[PDB]
Design a protein around this ligand. Sequence first.
Ligand SMILES: CC(C)(C)S(=O)(=O)C[C@H](C1CC1)N1C(=O)[C@@H](CC(=O)O)O[C@H](c2cccc(Cl)c2)[C@H]1c1ccc(Cl)cc1
Length: 88
Amino acid sequence: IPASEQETLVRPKPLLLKLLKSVGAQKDTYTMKEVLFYLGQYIMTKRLYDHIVYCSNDLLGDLFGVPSFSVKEHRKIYTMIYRNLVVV
Ligand SMILES: CC(C)(C)S(=O)(=O)C[C@H](C1CC1)N1C(=O)[C@@H](CC(=O)O)O[C@H](c2cccc(Cl)c2)[C@H]1c1ccc(Cl)cc1
């Protein structure tokens, strides 16, 4: 995963936007750096993470389509996030 990916510009779909709005200011266009931080912050503030995030109990699970995932499998995380946004 190249660092340049963090600079890419994206627009979250409605359910992802709902999640992001609980940790950051609403924007019409975000960088992937922003999306990753806000999602990460959401997970930490809600203590869904202690390397496993448990989200069967949360909107995040509905967004990702999984009951849990590892914080270390970055490829899979990127793929899960991208189902929930549109590139601009
Ligand atoms: C402290 C923080 C800045 C808020 S954070 O680093 O984002 C916290 C979250 C963790 C889920 C709660 N998080 C991490 O702890 C670490 C884990 C690691 O070292 O590999 O980085 C995660 C990360 C960062 C960038 C890209 C990806 Cl795909 C994952 C990264 C992570 C981000 C987003 C998701 Cl969906 C999952 C993990």
